[PDB]
Design a binder for this molecule. Structure first.
Ligand SMILES: O=C(CC1CCCCC1)N[C@@H](C(=O)NO)c1ccc(-c2cc(F)c(F)c(F)c2)cc1
Ligand SMILES: [Mg+2]
Ligand SMILES: [Mg+2]
Ligand SMILES: [Mg+2]
Ligand SMILES: [Mg+2]
Ligand SMILES: [Zn+2]
Length: 889
C-alpha cells in the first residue's frame, strides 16, 4: 500500500483551470463527460500526466480533441490514468473524457451513488476520482461548469454547486440543468443531487451587506414535515457567524439536502450541504430529544465550514484538523450560545475523555496532524476532530475573547480564497498573542507541539499554604507517556484556568486567572490569600489533559456544592466516583483471584451521597447537571485508569456503587421523578417545530435517568410509572419506557407497542433499534437474532446496521461475555459489511479499540477475532490497514 508522508508535499506539475462536466443519469448507468482546461505549472519537469480515476469505464479520452490510443499513449489500471509525457502538451491544453459509472450499485456511498430514489455524491476526501478523472487533491483549485441530465419523472429536482443558469427539456422524457460556479474550489467540494425532492425555504438578509440569501432544505416527499427545525438552525447559524465573528454568507443560495444512506453526519459541499437524514430531519412526534441538539450541531458545523474549509481551504490532507478542529470549535461556541445550558460543554468533555482519550492511549494513537496516511477514509478520527477542537479552543482561552476574535479575523482576511496550513493559523494567533502581551518578542512556537505530539498529557498538583504569610502556591507538573510516535515527549504550552474558592463562604478569592504552564513543572504563587483555599482547576476543561487534582474527597465535595464552574463541579464528582470505583474494583478483583469465601467492600462516602441529595433537592439547580451527578463515569473513561480490566469485575463494581447510592436516595429520586413531570412533559408547544426548549429536554433527561435508576432498583410499584410513561407523546419517554422495562415481565409487551409506534418512520425505527440493542436483557443475543431476522435483514443502510449493533457493544456484561461470543458476532458483522462498505465496516470495529486494555483472556479472544478478520481474502484496504495498526502488526 502507498504511504503518503506529510514532509513530501510538493505542488503539482499541472494546473486545472476549468472543469466542464456533463453528467447523464440513465437507468442502468451514468455517463460522465468532462473537459479539463489545463496548463503546465512552474514545477513541471516533463513528467507523465497522471490522473486519479477509480473504477471508471473508459469510453474515450482525448487531448485537444484528438482521441488517445490505449497502450501506445496511455495506460489505465482502474486507479491511475497515465498519459505518457511525449503526448502531453507543453502549453495550455484541453483534456477530455467520457466514462461510465454505476451509482445504483455503489453501496460504499463514496463518489456518485444512489440512496433510495435519490442520486447523490460524496467526494471528500478522494471520492471525486470515482466520478471522473482528476488530479484529486485539494490544492488543485478550478472553476466548475456542470450540466446534469436525467429522467424528469424520476428526478425532477437537479442540483449542483453555483448558480442554476439553464433548465431545458430533452427528448424521451428527460431534462437537464446547468450550474455555473465561477469561484475556484477544490474538487472534494463538488456535489450533485438528483431526485423527487420536496422542500421548505426562506430568505435570509445578511447583517451588513444586506444581501438576500435563499435558503432551501430538501428531503424525500414522505418526510417533508420534518424539515422545519433544520431551517431554523440554519438561520441561527448564519446569525451567529455574523454576530460573533462578523462573517456573512457570500452566495445567493444555500441548499441543505437529507439522504437516507450516508457514511457519517454531513458534508459541507459549497452551497449544497448534504446530510445523513438523522442529522437534518426531526419532528416532535417522530424524533427523540437528542435529534434537536444533533441537527443544530450538524447544520451549524457545515455552515461554519463555508469560511473554515471552503473559503479558506487546505493545502493537503495532513492539514485536515485546520478545517475540522476549527469548525468543531466554531460549532461548539455556537451550540453553547444557542442552548444556554452548561451540559452542552460538559457533553463535549464527556465525549473527549471517554472516546478520544481511549483512542489516544490505543495502538491507533496519532497527533491531530499525523505524519503519514495510507487510507484517507481512515484519517477522519475523534483525535483530528475533537482533540483538534480542544486545541483550537485553547487559543481562545489563552487570548481571551477580544484578542481571539482579532487573531481569527487576521487568519480569515489573510487566507480567504486560498489554501492554508496549520502554521498559518498559529501565525495569526501569535500576532494576537504579541498584541495581548504587549511584546513582539512573545511567540507561540511551543504551541505547535499540540499539532505534532500524540498522547494525552497528565497534569498533577501539589499545594502549600502559609497562614502567617497569607501566601498560597500551586505546584504543577506535566507528563506525556512515550508512545510509538515520540520516544521523548516535550512539555506543552498548557493553559490552566483557575479559581481559588474560600471554603468558609464559597466565594471567589482571585480574579479570572489562566496559568500558562510552559515547562515540565512550575510553581504559581499567590499573595494576600487570607485563608487556605480549595483550588478550582482547569475551569471549563481548559486543556485536553488527564487532571490529577490531588484533592481530598471533602475538598471535592465542597467544590461540587459551591464552586462557580460547571466543569470543575462535574469533574470533582467524577473524581470522587473514580476513587470509589478503583477501590471497589480492586476489592472485587482480589476476592475473585483469591477465591474468597467472604470479604469487605469500602462503602460509598456518606458525605458524598449527602451532597448529591443536597444538589438534587435544590430547586434552583440545573436538571441537566443533576443527571450527570447521579450517573457513574462512562465505562470508556474508567478503562483509561485500569490495567488488564476485567469487565465482569467492573460490572460488579458499578452495580455495588449504584445500589449503595440508591439504597440511600431512591425515595428522593422517586419524589423528583414525579414532581418533574409537569414541566418536563409540557405539551404546550408539541405542534410547534420552531420552539425548542433545551432546559425542558434536560428535565426529561433527568426524569429518564431517574426512572432507569429506580427500575434497576425494583423500586416498589415502579412498573406502574413505566407503563404510564409508555403512553407519553414524547419518543424520548416512550422509548425510555421500553429500555427500563427490561427489568420486568412487560418488556416484550412494550417491545411490540413501541415497535408499532416506530415502524412507519425510517429514523424513528432506527431509534427503536438502538433502544432494543441497548436494553439490559439477559436474552439480548436472542433479541439481536430476532432483530436480524425480522427487521434488519440484509439492509445496506449504515444507519440500520449501526443502530442494531453499536449500542449492544456497550453492554459491559454481555458484549464481553467470556465465551467471546459477542466479539465473534461483531466481527462477523464487520466482515459482512466490509464487502460493500469498508468505511462503515471500520466504524463497526470501534469496540475492539480497547482490546489490549482488558484482562488477558478477553485480550486473547478479541485478538483472535481481529486476526480472523485480517485473514479474509477479500478484506478491504480500509479494514486491513486499520486492523494491522490496531493489532500492532
Ligand atoms: O461526520 C463527521 C464527524 C466525524 C466522522 C468520522 C469520525 C470523526 C468524527 N464529520 C463530517 C464533517 O466534518 N462534516 O463537515 C465528515 C467526516 C467524514 C467525511 C468523509 C466521508 C466519506 F464518505 C469519505 F470517504 C471520507 F473519506 C470522509 C465527510 C464528512
Ligand atoms: Mg466502475
Ligand atoms: Mg442578526
Ligand atoms: Mg430503509
Ligand atoms: Mg503499533
Ligand atoms: Zn466538518
Amino acid at each position: 500500500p502507498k504511504i503518503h508522508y506529510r514532509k513530501d508535499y510538493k505542488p503539482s506539475g499541472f494546473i486545472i483551470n476549468q472543469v466542464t462536466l456533463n453528467i447523464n443519469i440513465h437507468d442502468q448507468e451514468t455517463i460522465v463527460r468532462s473537459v479539463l482546461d489545463m496548463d503546465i505549472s512552474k514545477h513541471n519537469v516533463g513528467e507523465d500526466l497522471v490522473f486519479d480515476g477509480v473504477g471508471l469505464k473508459i469510453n474515450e479520452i482525448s487531448i485537444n480533441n484528438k482521441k488517445l490510443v490505449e497502450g501506445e499513449e496511455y495506460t489505465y489500471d482502474n486507479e491511475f490514468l497515465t498519459i505518457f509525457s511525449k503526448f502531453v502538451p507543453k502549453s495550455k491544453f484541453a483534456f477530455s473524457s467520457e466514462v461510465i459509472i454505476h451509482p445504483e450499485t455503489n453501496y460504499a456511498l463514496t463518489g456518485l451513488y444512489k440512496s433510495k430514489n435519490i442520486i447523490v455524491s460524496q467526494c471528500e476526501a478522494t471520492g471525486f476520482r470515482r466520478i471522473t478523472f482528476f488530479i484529486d487533491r485539494p490544492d488543485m483549485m478550478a472553476k466548475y461548469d456542470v450540466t446534469v441530465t436525467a429522467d424528469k419523472e424520476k428526478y425532477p429536482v437537479l442540483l449542483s454547486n453555483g448558480d442554476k443558469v439553464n433548465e431545458f427539456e430533452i427528448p424521451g422524457g428527460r431534462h437537464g440543468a446547468r450550474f455555473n460556479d465561477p469561484p475556484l474550489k477544490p474538487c472534494y467540494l463538488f456535489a450533485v443531487v438528483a431526485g423527487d425532492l420536496k422542500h421548505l425555504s426562506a430568505t435570509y438578509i445578511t447583517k451588513y451587506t444586506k444581501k438576500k440569501v435563499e435558503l432551501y432544505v430538501f428531503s424525500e416527499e414522505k418526510y417533508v414535515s420534518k424539515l422545519q427545525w433544520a431551517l431554523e438552525c440554519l438561520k441561527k447559524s448564519m446569525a451567529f457567524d455574523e454576530d460573533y465573528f462578523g462573517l456573512e454568507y457570500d452566495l445567493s443560495r444555500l441548499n441543505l439536502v437529507a439522504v437516507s444512506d450516508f457514511n457519517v453526519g454531513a458534508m459541507e459541499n459549497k452551497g449544497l450541504n448534504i446530510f445523513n437524514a438523522n442529522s437534518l430531519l426531526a419532528s416532535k412526534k417522530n424524533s427523540i430529544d437528542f435529534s434537536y441538539a444533533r441537527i443544530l450541531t450538524v447544520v451549524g458545523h457545515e455552515y461554519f465550514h463555508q469560511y473554515t474549509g471552503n473559503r479558506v481551504t487546505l493545502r493537503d490532507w495532513f492539514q485536515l484538523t485546520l478545517k475540522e478542529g476549527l469548525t468543531v470549535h466554531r460549532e461548539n461556541l455556537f451550540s453553547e450560545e444557542m442552548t444556554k445550558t452548561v451540559t452542552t460543554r460538559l457533553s463535549h468533555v464527556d465525549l473527549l475523555r471517554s472516546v478520544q482519550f481511549l483512542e489516544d492511549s490505543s495502538p491507533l494513537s496519532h497527533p491531530i496532524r499525523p505524519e503519514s496516511y495510507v487510507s484517507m477514509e481512515n484519517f477522519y478520527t475523534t483525535t483530528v476532530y475533537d482533540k483538534g477542537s480542544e486545541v483550537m479552543r485553547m487559543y481562545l482561552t489563552i487570548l481571551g475573547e477580544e484578542y481571539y476574535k482579532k487573531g481569527f479575523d487576521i487568519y480569515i482576511k489573510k487566507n480567504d480564497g486560498n489554501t492554508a496550513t496549520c502554521e498559518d493559523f498559529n501565525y495569526a494567533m501569535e500576532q494576537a498573542y504579541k498584541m495581548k502581551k504587549a511584546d513582539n518578542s512573545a511567540n507561540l512556537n511551543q504551541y505547535l507541539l499540540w499539532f505534532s505530539q500524540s498522547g494525552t498529557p497528565h497534569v498533577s498538583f501539589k499545594y502549600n499554604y502559609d497562614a502567617e504569610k497569607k501566601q498560597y502556591s500551586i505546584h504543577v507538573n506535566q507528563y506525556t507517556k512515550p508512545d510509538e510516535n515520540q520516544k521523548e515527549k516535550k512539555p506543552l504550552f498548557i493553559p490552566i484556568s483557575v479559581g481559588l474558592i474560600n471554603p468558609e463562604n464559597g466565594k471567589e478569592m482571585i480574579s479570572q486567572t489562566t496559568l500558562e504552564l510552559t515547562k515540565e513543572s512550575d510553581t504559581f504563587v499567590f499573595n494576600n490569600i487570607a485563608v487556605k483555599p480549595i483550588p478550582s482547576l482547569f475551569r471549563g476543561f481548559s486543556a485536553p489533559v488527564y487532571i490529577e487534582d490531588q484533592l481530598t474527597d471533602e475538598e471535592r465535595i465542597l467544590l461540587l456544592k459551591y464552586d462557580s464552574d460547571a466543569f470543575v463541579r462535574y469533574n470533582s464528582c467524577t473524581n470522587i466516583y473514580m476513587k470509589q470505583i478503583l477501590m471497589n474494583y480492586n476489592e472485587f478483583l482480589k476476592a475473585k483471584n483469591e477465591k474468597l469465601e467472604s470479604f469487605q467492600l469500602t462503602p460509598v462516602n456518606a458525605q458524598f451521597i449527602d451532597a448529591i441529595k443536597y444538589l438534587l433537592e435544590d430547586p434552583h439547580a440545573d436538571a441537566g447537571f443533576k443527571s450527570y451527578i447521579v450517573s457513574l463515569p462512562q465505562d470508556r473513561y474508567i478503562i483509561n485508569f485500569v490495567s488488564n480490566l476485567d469487565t465482569d469485575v467492573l460490572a460488579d463494581t458499578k452495580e455495588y456503587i449504584y445500589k449503595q447510592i440508591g439504597d440511600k436516595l431512591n425515595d428522593v429520586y422517586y419524589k423528583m421523578f414525579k414532581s418533574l413531570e409537569a414541566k418536563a412533559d409540557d405539551l404546550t408547544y408539541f405542534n410547534d417545530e420552531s420552539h425548542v426548549d433545551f432546559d425542558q429536554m434536560n428535565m426529561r433527561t433527568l426524569r429518564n435517568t431517574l426512572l432507569s435508576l429506580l427500575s434497576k432498583a425494583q423500586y416498589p410499584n415502579i412498573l406502574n410509572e413505566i407503563i404510564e410513561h409508555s403512553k407519553s407523546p414524547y419518543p424520548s419517554n416512550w422509548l425510555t419506557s421500553l429500555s427500563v422495562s427490561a427489568y420486568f415481565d412487560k418488556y416484550f409487551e412494550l417491545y411490540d407497542k413501541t415497535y408499532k409506534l416506530s415502524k412507519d418512520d425510517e429514523l424513528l425505527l432506527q431509534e427503536w433499534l438502538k433502544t432494543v440493542s441497548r436494553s439490559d436483557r439477559k436474552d439480548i443475543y436472542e433479541i439481536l437474532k430476532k432483530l436480524e431476522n425480522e427487521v434488519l435483514k440484509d439492509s445496506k443502510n449504515p444507519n440500520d446496521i449501526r443502530a442494531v449493533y453499536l449500542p449492544f457493544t456497550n453492554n459491559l456484561r454481555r458484549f464481553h461475555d467470556i465465551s467471546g461470543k459477542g466479539y465473534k458476532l461483531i466481527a462477523e458483522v464487520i466482515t459482512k459489511t466490509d464487502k460493500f462498505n469498508p468505511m462503515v465496516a471500520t466504524q463497526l470495529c470501534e469496540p475492539f479499540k480497547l482490546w489490549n486494555k482488558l484482562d488477558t483472556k478477553r485480550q486473547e479472544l478479541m485478538l483472535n477475532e481481529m486476526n480472523t478478520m485480517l485473514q479474509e481474502p477479500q478484506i478491504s484496504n480500509n479494514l486491513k490497514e486499520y486492523l494491522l495498526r490496531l493489532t500492532n502488526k
